[PDB]
RNA sequence: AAUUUCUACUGUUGUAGAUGAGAAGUCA
DNA sequence: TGACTTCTCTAACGAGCTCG
DNA sequence: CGAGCTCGTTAGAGAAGT
């Protein structure tokens, strides 16, 4: 229905604050005398890092409730009884009632949980926090390791000692709820909430089954030799860490030896099966790598790895040696600076200098010895594993001459050495499985020969020849030393202050492959990379090759994955950089409360001095220049004092302030009511209190007793002065019922008067800190639109605004405000030759009188004060707003357009607003988009940034700033669909998207398309600045998108970017020729073909019964009247010209083909069966119908219609019609689409379905676009 | 060649489209 | 390789607690 | 030494899409 403006205002959250604030009046001068703000986003070695230095009291103690921790050895024998129920039952009896059992077990441990001594009062606010006896709690245990010697002082990071401990003891002391931030969040994430992102994860969700995992799965380890595992072997010499405490189900009172079952009992779990040593199973699973002697002693490892290696059982696999994993929740740089940013990345192979390998051997042993072991056929038939994956299937491409062939062999080498009826377990056992089996990797590497020529075969052992030769690239990277060496030779100081510009591109050059040469070794070895085991068994041959001798590289080359940003993302940076401290007003209220009656100590109240906000928070001491007393007297006209009180959720502060004691008889409550509230008889999910009796939601009780609360309500003491005149009692069905006024009325808010003097001498005499924020968007000059940031923030607090509901103040400042880094220079004065690099700017000149100075904002110390003004806020959430939109938005389908903002190559995107009828609207490219004084081009714009060597095109800037201008070139596309989006009520669908910056902004116009705030519509209207018309929902975590996610859709996401815009013909029936009978039997099914009588060129006939080709059958014939153009390489020749006319006589030539004759002569090109005779028949139909060409390379994208039209009308891209597509980058949408919007039949016929049809399948994107007739 | 910020900047002491802030774990 | 986390956006009320 | 005292806790809704 043109629903831009019908789905109106559906629910709302909030923005974030737009204002930067300079010391307005003399409060900028004023807190340098006072020197406030100087240590206020200075106190930043104590408020964030003591949140960190706080694990000494919150997480030894969050770990030290595993030291008294103990489950019911029974709960002990039903961790292996119940979750054998679950792990031997494959049912939800054992299982989901095991997962109740194991809920129950979640209060098995959890009981004790809530329950300890100090861990009662540490994540309360006397935890270090101040009682009268409540001492620091970690201030006891950190001053218990003061004397004592607890190592995380002096350990972690930025704490060298308990002695930090004053500021240990200061950093919470002043800000007291102000060191308290971090006890909301890390509170309660280890609540008995039932996810494992908690401890229940990792305290028993580790041990529940890694006691099962050593006892009711470790159960048949012992088959061979339990003692085997030398207990008086290993209790030679090495048994130190083996005097174990306290027995599970033993409970002995000795440092004494536990048993490998004497520790490993089910019940036996007072060493282990907890989350306090989780991994600690290969405490002795592992053995004991004796470092202070230097040795190893080989105990799990010796014995469950080492002589279940020394026995080698393929059925005795089931059980090895190994070790538990890694608990929850535990207590276990630059690539710019000048000095330091790549010499502390040199030593990461420096220390390799007099290296040595994990394989027992030097560095020069490493390569040679654990690199030099599996490329003779090391690794077995069923021995040896490669990562089967296309991360190493690029190595078909990088050493077999085809990614894409080198991968055939899951038809051939293991899979049709398998399966010779080829099955769609390719899609998963293999092909799909994430390791590639070398009985197909071996023998199949060697069966590669099986189809061409007997060159087409390979060595299976040859790709660990190809990766043999990895070794000799670290001797000149020794050489290579001198690479970042050249901009890095000025390091004495450790501060270096130059990185990346190009004065110094001796280092930029250099460093950019001086050790990341190594980068690719890595994407070359990607084979041998773990794969993480979650729903895969993965029952292969332990290919240990690259494991114990290469396993000292394996994960010793972790520096390269991980430093995808560590070395190479402070070139790619910026040159001034803009992070500071963010500085408090003298408490946790430092901005906290800023409502109408914290202004004795919330410490927060505005200021709008008649032109725009400038607000200012009272003095530290002298906390009353607005006290209510002396505001009384200095009424006049010269500031802003803003009245405005608020209230909390409607049943979170409701019955919890008119309901509490002091005013229990000041309200006089009554009894008949009050056993609602001592049952929860009116709460849904509801309680008394502590000695309560749950009842259900009694609403007959909830609606007199709730209804009493607004009699009670009724007595406003001091929140008598809001009027919230809620409905009637009976309306109000739920709590929330009752609370649909909770926050329907309980924010009001009003300006106030204030001297000029009174302000002025007030502030003169420093009451208020004086804070005068205002930016440029909204300054004296200013005149075009105002800006996001600026077009609310002194737009909702203002006199439309508080007249209906738009949106509040919330909480949440800070006065953030720290140094500057770029000691300031113009850099070109005004009055001098400001060249304009704009594309159509005709004054080539500019000389302005105030300069361009050129960063500005950057120079020195501005203000940061920004509050979270919840926009939206007086609606609820819209639940199924899909549902909402394919219920609203599908129900104006006539008035219903569909923008399909696609993709493409060579232009930027293809916004082809497709029609009703099939025909494009706008098909506008979006190269280069601007306004009516410039367009801001970038479609070469872009192309203009790149373009440059060295290092091949891949540097820092073009890494950097050609992708940040597609960073910057995404925002007018947003307008775009902006604007075009309701320009005819189209639903903008850039369609199904699961690259890196063209779905990372794919979802970065879809999260501002929620609501509309444009900054020219009529400022009530509809549309406009403050009422919007609600789009899309929320957007949280990338994946979660799928299908009708609001308005960024799903369309059929591959197989339109070749489309065929007339018929859509069948283009995967495309042989190569190699077999030539097979080539033969490709011209058996080639249907019928004769020479162009009238199609002017020969041809090709088969339909899909012809080939394995199941869409339809038909003579469509596919003909020779258009042109070729070619491709090829550099320098081949990257542009070449051909003919699809020609090559009709020129094969009828070649053979005896009378291509005049007018008959079947593919018989004739089937008798011909010369080698190249049968394979130039295939090429000439390589290019017999694949239109898209570049128009020159590139150049042009010149479409050609492969199959013609009913008028024989085979329309090309070079010279298309209107509606039709435009070109290879810009029209590449254009069916993307096309095929998205056959999918409104699934919007225009949506029924009881609650998923709907969103899934594609290509055969009906086929048959759709076929169906067009 | 200037912005709370960021990219594009002349649209000249700012124009233009845009921006959720901070938390705070992590898997890549 | 960037997501996947997930919650912080509140003022009155009884505390403690030095006053009055 | 009741003045109430300044800060720290304290209070509990139903929401909702392979």
Redesign the pocket.
């Known amino acids: 229905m043109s629903i831009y403006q019908e789905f109106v205002n559906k629910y709302s959250?909030?923005?974030?604050?737009?204002?930067?604030l300079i010391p307005q009046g003399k409060t900028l001068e004023n807190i340098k005398a006072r020197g406030l703000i100087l240590d206020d986003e200075k106190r930043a070695k104590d408020?964030?890092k003591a949140?960190?230095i706080i694990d000494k009291y919150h997480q030894f103690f969050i770990e030290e409730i595993l030291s008294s921790v103990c489950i019911s050895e029974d709960l002990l024998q039903n961790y292996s009884d119940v979750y054998f129920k679950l792990k031997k039952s494959d049912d939800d009896n054992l299982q989901k009632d095991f997962k109740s059992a194991k809920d129950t077990i979640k209060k098995q441990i959890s009981e004790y949980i809530k329950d300890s001594e100090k861990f009662k009062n540490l994540f309360?606010?006397?935890?270090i926090?101040?009682?009268?006896?409540?001492e620091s709690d970690l201030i006891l245990w950190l001053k218990q390791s003061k004397d004592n010697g607890i190592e995380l002082f002096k350990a972690n990071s930025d704490i060298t000692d308990i002695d930090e401990a004053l500021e240990i003891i200061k950093s919470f002391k002043g800000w007291?709820?102000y060191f308290?931030?971090?006890h909301?969040?890390?509170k309660?994430?280890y609540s008995s909430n039932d996810?494992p992102?908690s401890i229940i994860y990792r305290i028993v969700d580790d041990n529940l089954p890694k006691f099962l995992e050593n006892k009711a799965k470790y159960e048949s380890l012992k088959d061979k030799a339990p003692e085997a595992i030398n207990y008086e072997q290993i209790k030679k010499d090495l048994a130190e860490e083996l005097t174990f405490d306290i027995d599970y189900k033993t409970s002995e009172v000795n440092q004494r030896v536990f048993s490998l079952d004497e520790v490993f009992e089910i019940a036996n779990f007072n060493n282990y099966l907890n989350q306090s040593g989780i991994t600690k199973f290969n405490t002795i699973i592992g053995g004991k790598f004796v470092n202070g002697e230097n040795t190893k002693r080989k105990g799990i490892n010796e014995y469950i790895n080492l002589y279940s290696q020394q026995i080698n059982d393929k059925t005795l696999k089931k059980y090895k040696m190994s070790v538990l994993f890694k608990q929850?929740?535990?207590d276990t740089d630059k690539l710019e600076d000048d000095s330091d940013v790549v010499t502390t990345m040199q030593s990461f192979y420096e220390q390799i200098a007099a290296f040595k390998t994990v394989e027992e051997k030097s560095i020069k042993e490493t390569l040679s010895l654990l690199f030099d072991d599996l490329k003779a056929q090391k690794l077995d038939l069923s021995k040896i594993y490669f990562k089967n994956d296309k991360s190493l299937t690029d190595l078909s491409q990088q050493v077999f001459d085809d990614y894409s062939v080198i991968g055939t062999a899951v038809l051939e080498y293991i899979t049709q050495q398998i399966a010779p009826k080829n099955q769609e377990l390719i899609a998963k056992k293999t092909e799909k499985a994430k390791y590639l089996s070398l009985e197909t990797i071996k023998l199949a590497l060697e069966e590669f020969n099986k189809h061409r020529d007997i060159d087409k075969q390979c060595r299976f052992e040859e790709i660990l020849a190809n990766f043999a030769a990895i070794p000799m690239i670290f001797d000149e990277i020794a050489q290579n030393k001198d690479n970042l060496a050249q901009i890095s030779i000025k390091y004495q100081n450790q501060g270096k202050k130059d990185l990346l510009q190009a004065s110094a591109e001796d280092d930029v050059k250099a460093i950019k492959d001086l050790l990341d040469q190594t980068n690719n070794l890595l994407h070359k070895l990607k084979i041998f990379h773990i794969s993480?085991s979650?729903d895969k068994a993965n029952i292969l041959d332990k290919d240990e090759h690259f494991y114990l001798v290469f396993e000292e590289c394996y994960f010793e080359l972790a520096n390269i994955?991980?430093?995808?940003?560590?070395i190479?993302?402070y070139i790619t940076q910026?040159?001034?950089?803009?992070e500071?401290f963010?500085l408090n007003f003298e408490?946790?209220?430092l901005a906290?409360?800023?409502?109408?009656?914290?202004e004795?100590?919330?410490t927060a109240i505005l200021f709008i001095k008649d032109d725009k906000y400038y607000l200012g928070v009272m003095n530290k001491k002298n906390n009353k220049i607005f006290d209510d007393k002396a505001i009384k007297e200095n009424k006049g006209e010269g500031y802003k004092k803003i009245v405005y009180?608020?209230?909390?959720?409607?049943?979170?502060?409701?019955?919890?302030?008119?309901?509490?004691?002091?005013?229990?008889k000041?309200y006089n409550p009554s009894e008949d009511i009050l056993r609602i509230?001592n049952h929860?008889t009116?709460?849904?999910?509801?309680?008394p209190?502590k000695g309560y009796e749950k009842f259900e939601?009694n609403i007959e009780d909830?609606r007199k007793f709730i209804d009493f609360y607004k009699q009670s309500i009724s007595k406003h003491?001091?929140?008598k002065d809001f009027g919230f005149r809620f409905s009637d009692t009976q309306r109000y069905?739920?709590?929330?019922?009752?609370?649909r006024e909770?926050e329907n009325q309980?924010?009001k808010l009003t300006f106030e008067n204030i001297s000029e003097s009174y302000i002025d001498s007030v502030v003169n005499q420093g009451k208020l800190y004086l804070f005068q924020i205002y930016?440029?968007?909204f300054?004296?000059?200013?005149?075009?639109?105002?800006?996001?940031?600026?077009?609310y923030?002194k737009a909702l607090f203002d006199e439309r605004n508080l007249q209906d509901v738009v949106y509040?103040?919330?909480?949440?400042a800070?006065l953030?405000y720290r140094k500057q880094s770029i000691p300031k220079k113009?850099?070109?004065?005004?009055?001098?030759?400001?060249?304009?690099?704009?594309?159509?700017?005709?004054?080539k000149?500019?000389?302005?009188?105030?300069?361009?100075?050129?960063?500005?904002?950057?120079?020195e110390d501005?203000?940061?004060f920004?509050?979270?003004?919840?926009?939206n806020?007086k609606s609820?959430?819209?639940?199924?707003?899909?549902?909402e939109i394919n219920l609203l938005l599908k129900e104006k389908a006539n008035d219903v357009h569909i923008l399909s903002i696609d993709r493409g190559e060579r232009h930027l995107a293809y916004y082809t607003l497709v029609d009703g009828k099939g025909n494009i609207i706008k098909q506008d490219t979006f190269n280069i988009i601007?306004?009516?004084?410039?367009?801001?081009?970038?479609h070469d714009?872009l192309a203009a940034?790149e373009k440059d060597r060295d290092s091949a095109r891949k540097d820092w800037k073009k890494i950097?700033?050609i992708k940040?201008?597609?960073?910057?070139?995404?925002?007018?596309?947003?307008?775009?669909?902006?604007?075009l989006v309701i320009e005819y009520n189209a639903i903008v669908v850039f369609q199904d998207l699961?690259?890196?910056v063209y779905?990372?902004?794919e979802?970065?116009?879809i999260?501002?398309?929620?609501y509309?705030?444009?900054?020219?519509n009529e400022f009530d209207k509809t549309g406009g600045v403050l009422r919007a018309y609600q789009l899309t929902?929320?957007f949280?975590?990338?994946?979660?998108?799928?299908?009708?996610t609001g308005i960024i859709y799903y369309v059929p996401a591959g197989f339109t970017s070749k489309i065929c815009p007339v018929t859509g013909f069948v283009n995967q029936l495309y042989p190569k020729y190699e077999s030539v009978s097979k080539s033969q039997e490709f011209f058996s099914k080639f249907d019928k073909i004769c020479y162009n009588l009238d199609k002017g060129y020969f041809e090709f006939s088969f339909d899909y019964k012809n080939f394995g080709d199941k869409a339809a059958k038909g003579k469509w014939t596919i003909a020779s009247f258009g042109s070729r153009l070619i491709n090829f390489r550099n320098s081949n020749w990257d542009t070449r010209e051909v003919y699809p006319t020609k090559e009709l006589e020129k094969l009828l030539k070649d053979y005896s083909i009378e291509y005049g004759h007018g008959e079947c002569i593919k018989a004739a090109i089937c008798g011909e069966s010369d080698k190249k005779f049968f394979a130039k028949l295939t090429s000439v139909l390589n290019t017999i119908l694949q239109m898209r060409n570049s128009k020159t390379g590139t150049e042009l994208d010149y479409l050609i219609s492969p199959v013609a039209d009913v008028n024989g009308n085979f329309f090309d891209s070079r010279q298309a019609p209107k509606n039709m597509p435009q070109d290879a980058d810009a029209n590449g949408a254009y069916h993307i689409g096309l095929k998205g919007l056959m999918l409104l039949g699934r919007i225009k016929n949506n029924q009881e379905?609650?998923?709907?049809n969103l899934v594609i399948k290509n055969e009906e994107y086929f048959e759709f676009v076929q169906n067009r007739n």
Not at 866 to 871: A, D, E, L, R, S
């Open positions: 959250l909030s923005k974030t604050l737009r204002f930067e408020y964030k949140k960190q309360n606010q006397n935890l926090d101040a009682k009268k006896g409540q007291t709820t308290k931030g971090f909301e969040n890390r309660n994430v996810i992102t929850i929740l535990s993480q979650e994955v991980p430093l995808y940003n560590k190479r993302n910026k040159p001034y950089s803009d500071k963010k408490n946790s209220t906290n409360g800023w409502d109408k009656n914290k004795p100590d919330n009180k608020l209230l909390p959720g409607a049943n979170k502060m409701l019955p919890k302030v008119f309901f509490s004691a002091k005013s229990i000041f509230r929860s009116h709460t849904k999910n509801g309680s209190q939601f909830c003491p001091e929140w069905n739920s709590i929330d019922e009752f609370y909770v309980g924010y930016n440029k968007d300054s004296a000059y200013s005149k075009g639109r105002p800006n996001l940031h600026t077009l923030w509040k103040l919330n909480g949440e800070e953030f113009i850099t070109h004065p005004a009055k001098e030759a400001i060249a304009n690099k704009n594309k159509d700017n005709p004054k000149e500019s000389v302005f009188e105030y300069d361009l100075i050129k960063d500005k904002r950057f120079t501005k203000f940061f920004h509050c979270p003004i919840t926009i806020f609820s959430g819209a639940n199924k707003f899909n549902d601007g306004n009516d004084r410039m367009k801001t081009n970038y714009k940034i950097n700033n940040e201008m597609k960073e910057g070139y995404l925002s007018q596309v947003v307008h775009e669909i902006a604007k699961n690259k890196q779905q990372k902004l979802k970065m116009l999260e501002k398309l929620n509309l705030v444009f900054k020219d929902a929320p949280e975590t990338f994946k979660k998108m799928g299908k009708q379905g609650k998923k709907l």
